[PDB]
Amino acid sequence: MGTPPGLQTDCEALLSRFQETDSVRFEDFTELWRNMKFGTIFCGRMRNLEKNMFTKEALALAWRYFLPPYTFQIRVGALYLLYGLYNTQLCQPKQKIRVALKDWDEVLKFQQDLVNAQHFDAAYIFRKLRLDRAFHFTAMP
Amino acid sequence: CNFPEYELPELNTRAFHVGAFGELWRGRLRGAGDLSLREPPASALPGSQAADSDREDAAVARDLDCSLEAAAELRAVCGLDKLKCLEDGEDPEVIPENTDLVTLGVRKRFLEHREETITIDRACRQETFVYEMESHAIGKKPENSADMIEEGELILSVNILYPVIFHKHKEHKPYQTMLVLGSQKLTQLRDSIRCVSDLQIGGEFSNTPDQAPEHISKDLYKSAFFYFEGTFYNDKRYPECRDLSRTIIEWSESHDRGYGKFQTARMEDFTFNDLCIKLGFPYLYCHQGDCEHVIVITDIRLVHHDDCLDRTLYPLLIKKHWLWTRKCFVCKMYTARWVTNNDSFAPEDPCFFCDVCFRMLHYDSEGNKLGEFLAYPYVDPGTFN
Amino acid sequence: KLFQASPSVPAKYVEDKEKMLSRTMQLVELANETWLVTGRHPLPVITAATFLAWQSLQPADRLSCSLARFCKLANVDLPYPASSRLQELLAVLLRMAEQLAWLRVLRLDKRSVVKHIGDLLQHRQSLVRSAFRDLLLPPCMLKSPKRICPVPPVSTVTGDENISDSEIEQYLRTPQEVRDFQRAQA
Amino acid sequence: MGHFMKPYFKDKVTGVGPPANEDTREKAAQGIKAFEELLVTKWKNWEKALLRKSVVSDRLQRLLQPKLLKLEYLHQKQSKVSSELERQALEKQGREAEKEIQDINQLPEEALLGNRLDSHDWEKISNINFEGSRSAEEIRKFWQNSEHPSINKQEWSREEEERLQAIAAAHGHLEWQKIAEELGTSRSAFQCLQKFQQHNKALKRKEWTEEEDRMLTQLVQEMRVGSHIPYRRIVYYMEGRD
Amino acid sequence: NKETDMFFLAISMVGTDFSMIGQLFPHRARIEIKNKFKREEKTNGWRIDKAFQEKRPFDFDFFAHLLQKVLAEEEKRK
C-alpha cells in the first residue's frame, strides 16, 4: 500500500505547524487538532474493512514519523498524532499501532527521557496508549 | 544477534530464530502485562474519569515519578474532549464538511462521482475476505479450555500460494494467508490445507463414465514436506508418505545447479518456534509430489487480547485470493466436470464438458458410447479454491 | 560433444552421429562445388555446414538457436568469419531453392528454408547445374562493374633532357630557416 | 524475488528440473491429470490464417511430390542414358510431368484444400510448421471441425432454431449427431447442442427445486463467512446454473 | 581540417617525406602519413603539384613554433 491518498500531506502539515509553534505542550496540539478537525478523518463512507486498513496504515505512518532521527519536538508531536489517531477511530475492535522489536525498547527509552525532561504530557499520553494497549508487538511496522 | 532488520526496503528481512525472537519480545514485556490476554481499562472523557481516577492516578504517579495531583492534572489535560472532533452519535457514512483535511477532500472527490443512478451502490470497495474472516474470529474465545492460546504466544502469518499461478502478472500473487502459533508443529499446518491438489483424480472412462475412480489423490498419496533454510521436513506418518527430498538432494547435489547442500528431517520433529526463518523472503512447501507452494512469512507478532483467542479455528485463514471456475465449452456458462481428448464432436482438443453437457452428448439413452473420444473425470481448481 | 547425453547439455540436442556426418559431408560438398571454399579458411565452412545439419535434423526446436549458443554447448571457439560464411551459404541455398516448384511457390525465407535441406540435396546435381546457367564469383566484384581494368593514358614520354627546371626550384631551403634547423629536436 | 516462481528450484545452467519421481511416475501410470493441462489458448485470427496456409502447403506438397520426384528421376535417367530413342521417350515423359507441375501450380487454393475428411500430415505440421506449440491432434480437430471451409459457419436462422428445438425432443435431446443430420443444414452435433443449451429452458433454470435449495443452503452455511458467500462456485455442485 | 592543411604544408616544405613529419607531429607514425597520402592523392593532386615548385624555406624553429601555436589554437577552438 504505502500511504493513503492524502494522509501524508495532512500529517506533515500538522507536524510542521506544531514544530513551528515551538511548544511541546499537548494543549497547543489539541487546539490545532480541533482547529483543522483532523479527528473527522475516520468518517466518510468507509466500510469496516477499509476503515481497518486505513487505521492500520495511518498508525504505521504516524509511527514512522514518531521514530528517530526526528528531534524532540517533532517526535512529541508525532506521539500526539498517534494518540489522537488511535483515540478517535471507530473500528471494532480498535486497531492498534504496529511496533517493531527494534523500536519498542527505543520508545521505552524515549518515554524515560520524557519523564526525566519533566515534560509529563507526552509520557502520560504514551502510558495511556499502553493502558489501552494500542501497540501490537510485531517485528516491523 | 536475533535483531530483525530489512535486507531490502519493505520487501524482506534478516533471518532470526523464532524461539529466541519470542523470548526477546517476552523479556521486554513479561511482568509489564502489556502482552496479557485480559481486557485493560480504556480512555474516556474527563467527565467520566472519576470512577477510574482512583485506580489510574496512583499508577501514573508511580510510573511517571510525578505527584498524584500532577497525575490528575495530566489526566484532565489529556482527556478525549480535546481530541474528539466527532461526537459518539455521528454516523461514518457521510463526510463531515466542517474539516480542512486534504484526505477528506480526496475522499469527497471519490464519493461525488459515485452518486449517480448508474454509479450509486454499496458494493465491494476493493476486497471482502479480510474483514469477513477478521470479524468472524477477532476478539473471540474458545469453547474448550484445551483450545486456549497461551499468553504471550507468538502469532505467525504465513502466505501459501496456489498451484495455479496467473503466469501473466508478477506484482500480485495467488495466495491464502494462514495464521499459526509458535508452539504448533508443522503437522497441524499441513493437515489443515484444503488445496485442490489433494482432490485430483484421473482415469479414462469414455466407455463406462460411471466407473470413476473410488480414491482421490489424498487417499492414494500422502507425501508432503516443507522447506526452510535448506532443511526438508518430510511427512512419514503413513505408508503412503515418501521422503521426496531424497530425490531432490540426489539430483541437485550431483551438479552446480545453483543451490547449496540440503538436509533431510521429519515433518513432526520441529515446531514453529524452532525455525530460523526470514520474514517476507519466500520459502517452499510441497505436497502430492508435484503441487509446490510458495511460502512467505509475512508477519510475526505476540498474541493480543483483542486477537482471535479461539484455537479451534487455528490454523486461521485471514486472507485468500480468488480463482475463476473452468466452465465447459458447450453451454459456456456451467462449470466443467469432464475433459475429453481425441473427441470427434468437440471443436478443439482438449475440450471441457459438464455432466449435463457430457452424458447426453457422448452417450445415448442406453449409455452406449457414441463417436470416437476419450473422457476423463475433471475437478475444477477454480471451484474448490 | 553433441553425441553424448552429458548433463551439461539437454538430451533434446543429442543425435545419431552417422546421419550427422552424412548431412555435413554432403553440405560441404555443395559448398565446395559452388566455389565457396576456394581461397578461404575451410574451418568456418565446416562449422556452418555442421550448423545447417544440426538445425535440419530437428527444426522443431533447434531453429530458435544461434551461433553463440551452439558453440557454447559444443565448447568450441567459432571463427569470426563463420557468420559471413553462413550468410553467403544462405544466399546459395536461396538460389538453389528458387528452382524447386514447391519451394518457389511456398515463398520461403532465410530462416524457414532449413527444414527442406534433405529435399534439395536429394536432387542436388541437376538443380545446381541449372543454377549455374543463370556460376558463383565473389560478391564484391559481382556489383556489376561496367568498367573493367580501364586502360591508363600513355605517358612514357621523357622529354629531351629536362622537361622543366622549376621543380628543382622547390627542393632547397633558403638560409633564413636553415640556420635555426638545430634547436627544436635537441 | 520473481526468480522463485515455479519450479521453485531450477537448474542455473540449463533451467531443467529434477527427473521423474516415484509418486509422479505412479500417478502417470494411473493417468491422473495435472493442473497445467487445463491451460487452453484461444485461436487468434493470425493462428487461423497460419493453419490455412499450412494446410494449403501440405496439399500442394502432397500433390507435387510424386510428380516432381518422377520428373527428377526421369531427368537423371536421361542424363545417364545415351540411347537416342529412349532419351526422346524420357524427354517426352519429362515434358508431360512438367505440364502436370504447371497445371498443379495453376490450380486454385480451394481445389488444393479439398474435402474436410482428406488426409494430412498432421504430425509434420504440429512439429515443424507450428514448432510443437499445438499438438497434432489439437490442430487436426480444430481444422476439421471449425476451420475447414465446408463447415457451416453462418448464423442460425430463426426457422433453423425452431426446427432444432422441435427435433431435439424427437430424439430425447440425445444423440445430437442424429439431430444435426435430421436438421439438414450441415451442422454438427457440437454446434446443435451448443445452440440448444444456450436456448434450453431445462438447462437455464429460471425454476427452483427442493434439492437445489437444500444443497445451496448447506454449502453456503459450510463456507460463508460474514457477508461473503461463494455465489457461483456452488454451481459446480448444482446443475443447470452459472 | 587543420591537420590536413598542415600535412599538405609540410609536404611542400619537407616534400613527399613522412618520417620527419611523423617525428615533428606529436602522435603520428610514418604508416599514418603514408595512409593520409594514399587517401588524399585521389583528390588533391593539384595541391601536391603546388608542393614542388616554390622554394620557401623549412625550419624546426619557426615551424615547430607555428605547429604548436596553431595546434593550441585549434584545440582551444575545436
Ligand SMILES: [Zn+2]
Ligand atoms: Zn496444493
Ligand SMILES: [Zn+2]
Ligand atoms: Zn450441461
